[PDB]
């Protein structure tokens, strides 16, 4: 038994789709799922995907409500797609994967994992359901999560944050850290020391360190000179520069909180995804001082500090590979008669 | 058990819906229904209606598939409703009623035709289902059509052909011809004496009687002088004029036949519904005489001669009163010097 | 004269439709009216409902722009089709009413409302027009409001608030209060004694009364002592437990706006409408605890003490009605030696 | 009072937009018009061009009724918009032209042709309307078509076929010849001598002189050793090849029709317009012979004789400029000791 | 090299249309640009113009990124179109003007300004590009802005504000003050002196004299004491009359911002665009009084005060003409006994 109007009954009763039968009517017009209550239509999902709206609705519909690994986290690992259930991007709108397992008739590719056509590509295990731990060890190309220690298996610590229902949060009623293991054409292979993402919004930045608090609260003079920051030059790529009509740096997510709430500006998020790194058009109001292409970057103040504090300054240009949330970031490095000049990530 | 893949497995296997269980995928796209066919897209149906893509595919499922009584034939006895079935307008690709009895629960006003709300609406009965002919004598207002002779009440004939998936027949391995009965505030009324108009195409004209015949067969005037039609101006009213550019009359289906076979011309139906008159912008293209509002109608000719041989050929001027199709349409006649010019019907 | 470049005249001018003569040009293009004004094309409205963009274009005009009840009032009285005006449901945007009453051709079933098509729909009349109770006599089925006393009927006081243009005010310019009659098949039957909902949003929050302006200033333990709620178990039904990953009970406005404030949260309004109880989809973002169906209803605090300190402690499960906004409102109730452990409303 | 409710009744009653005031109810749904006669929607426009929706709908309603000029008569000279009228291109199922000058408000770039605007555009005029004679000798650049003579002009005899609703006809109850005239930047000039296409329909050819019908009815050897037509090569131009893979040839219409009845084959007019020359998808269904681009050209088979037996045999290759339809076609002519081998339509 | 997949690889990479040369995939559909970026695929561009998706997603990009003259500016000089660029209406989501010249092929009537067809049209050239100062002196109808002096011409200093990506700021990194210049016919033109409207929104108001701060802060008494405001009424034009049913006054965006910190209210935007003059429909959401056609005008209160202290209070309705952004406002007054009543924008 499986109907859109059983979809929809779930959607009325439970909130997302379980698995009790019953069915009520539905409407289908322009992109818009309605039903009736009470004499009245009523609408329930709205598509913004690349697929008929039918099939998105169901798609929407047995999405995962438990703690979830981020977008950028699975992408970085090169997931490919997910084993019986559904990831969805609460940025885009959409499905983080185009194909299913065993979840959606019309997306499905195999009924289960272990079919002969899902062996090159990397699926995605939860090791909280059960059995996911063995098909885990059966596949060829895969990742695999478990909150605990796997006998025999090496363990990756990975963010200590989650998306929950499109929030991101660190949880005390759940768990949301996971240890992550991957395998390549077999083969268990390791995963690098890395830095990690905060992951935090603008217009409710938290701070997460005594740094970070003295950062928000203390001048710009009385920061540098404290946590000895001279030369290093702070002031442009994390305070940024605004005299003139091309915006200096800002580069640090940090570095739009305190602006922010000073002096409020204009955000383009052209190609709104989630990203390691991000890119955005910037508009200072108040001033007038702008940038097309502004990488912006979220890190612990102090992460940032330790990746400062341990390059060479002699060099005048220097490629610098960073590996954050599993994959190498590469910045830009300028030096000038034993202090820096700017420090940004690569184009 | 209904449901959207329910509806199309029906479809798939039986060609319409026969009640039988399973379900198949289904994909809505832009007023299209599409199902997976060995991996294949499929169209199924294209909506053309006023109606959600859904609700209007389920309704062509439950169409009726058996012999029912024409659009304009429901339409000029007025009826409002279909009870417990689906008269679908061939012509219009939509449903001849907007509102169902216990058929589809998105278009359901009722579920048993008896209840309240449907007492002052005209409700359709068919006579052949089980147990028709009890409710609509319980019932305040409808039509009824039968096969038989039907205890207490008095019949009348009704035409000889019929709509069977959209193919206006006379059938022989089936039965074509109806006796209508008709309730109106609880009285039985009795329908008036009519003629019928025979519902013909012009590629595929096929003459009904002697006197078509040798119309399509003889000339002009070795027509006029057997069957003695001196003065009643067959020559304009039947044959047409195409003198001059504004076309003279052709307000028999008869001769468009026969212009037709000797010399096409263009035709538009820019109002396109079963109507027991039509009007088309035609456009003969050989001369060149033309006319935007051209009153066409089909009748048996055997039945038009009838007519026009029993009219006061006195008076200038008279609107004419005629009763084709279960209803009074309006003629004008013009007379000079005893004989007829113009006969056409009144817009 | 009603045509859609005039009604478009009277939003450029008057803001609605006054009635005023006089058209501009108008471009119709997915879902969407446009107009020229100084050689730009302005949008006008953009079609959110299930009715044809130009049908819902003129029912966005015509509106009533008085004071009206709000659509929950209306739906839990069965209220059917208004008489002569169009009470628009803020909240979908669309009409609270399909069917009109001598206002928009397209949607009219009849002029006036005593024709005989009107008599078994609720239709709702408004007093402060000339001669509606006169109308509201003689029809069948209906609900009459008034400013004031109507001869020889017994009123009911509704509630203080209602909607004005979409925003709920308790009005001292206007009176926003009205006298409720109903009529059953030409009976005139008593309304109930009932609560009324206060109608209040989460993030613009506001106490009435001396009790909910101390739940919201003083502690969790300081407001139990005083009023004296000792074994009644406010901590989980109105403040909320968070500890584990299933969030507890919360079922009053009145504790989210508390939890708001301190901790903000997701809400998913699926089946978004106006219906006394709300059921939203919870993800505390602080500590990660959640619950997909979370009956929540808004009451005066002090009217659920007096509701729930008048219940016989005794038994261990009891199906409780409350007479909320004209309709019974099942509750359930959990009670273990001598305390209560949960009350909510029943799903 | 101009409006869609009062367009659309003018095309229920009389056909097109004549100007009667009168308004029918109108629905717009997903580029269709619609209108509710006796409670069912009926279909009245298709908007199949650029334009929004109903623009395109008012614009066919007030389309020219009169024989004029075809589209590429009017796209070979210079003219750009039309005078007070509207020219429907039925071939694209959209009007010929964008703009227009007094006619729709939302097309409109001017109330009257001699508004400062319209100077540098070529305005067409048509003589057989009250004035506008008289605005042609006040105009700048624009086009004059006459029935009969005006004083102190040259007149230059058009073709003998003009468009009347869409149907290509030489009429005898009409009169399809006009007298053509020219202003450029105020200069009238001399418009030359040139040959005329027939316009001629594959499916319904009919030939125009004694060579075209002893053409169809006679062989190949014979209708080339009458008419003297050795070394010119008619065997490939106008017969065509089918012996291998690519088509040989074949660029007379005539050349279509007589082998279209000896058996059909298949054509895509992949640009859909009315051009002077026409290029084709042809794939023969009998050899299996086809061709992507296959110039076509419809002439008078004397007026193709006429061109080719007055060309200089002697040069291998020479490109050929003949004026058809008051323009400059250009042609590619082979030869090979004596005798021509091609002669095609250049591309 | 011009086409969509090199437009949409200047937005992924650039931020705009920065002209340079590449490619990447593209798909297309319901007015929504979409581009595949590591497998998923990512919205570029909603379409909310009037125009075909790709071109208005090809007008976006080439949009005019340096501080430009607002639209309201430009269309009280008559600007009827943009020379080699492109001014777009944040506030509508479309071009400001629908024609271009040497930008977009689709949307393009000329490749230079200097054509004949652009003779009769309102030219806007931009002084800060090369050359442009020279074909303003060669155009016929054109307006001209420069940050300097141009030598042998009059200027106009125009308002201190400017729209810099949507934003109007007084920008000083960047100048953001034009000098105007303005030719009808070729003879150049003398702009008259006038007043600005400030451009501000409600929910960041500022003030920007010491009179607006003292408005703001002090009561409704002690402002109208000390500035000498008795019998001007300030207290019904500024304040606002709240008491009854319908509102009074209120015609000041400086009263709108002292209303709404106090006590929020409803503003309906219809016809929603830049005017000097704007016309909203309010709802006072503590009382209850509204209006539905409310003019309201951003003026420094000082110019507010300018005004209405140089005018006749003897005559009891008088209309009075005053400059604002190069236009002409008609004001209406009303007397009575010495001191005004009212003082609004006329309708």
New interface residues.
Partial sequence: ??????VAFN??????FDGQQG?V???????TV?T?????????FEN???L????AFELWAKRN?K?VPEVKIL?NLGV?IAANTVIW?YK?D?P?HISTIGVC??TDIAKKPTETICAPLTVFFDGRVDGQVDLFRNARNGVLITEGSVKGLQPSVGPKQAS????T?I????K?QFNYYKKVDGVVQQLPETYFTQSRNLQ?FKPRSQMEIDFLELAMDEFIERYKLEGYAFEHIVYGD????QLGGLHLLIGLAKRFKES?F?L?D????DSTVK?Y?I?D??????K??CSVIDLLLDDFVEIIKSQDLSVVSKVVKVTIDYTEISFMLWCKDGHVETFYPKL
Avoid: W
């Fill in positions: 038994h499986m109907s859109l109007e059983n959607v009325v009763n439970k909130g997302h069915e009517p539905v409407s289908i017009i322009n992109n309605y009736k209550v009470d004499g009245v239509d009523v609408e329930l913004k995907t690349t008929p709206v039918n099939v409500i703690p992408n490919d991007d885009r959409a983080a008739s019309m929950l229902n499109g929030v949060l949880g005390e009623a759940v949301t409710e605004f005299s003139h009509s409020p204009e383009e052209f190609i709104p995804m890119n058009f508009t109001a108040q001033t007038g001082s702008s097309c292409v």
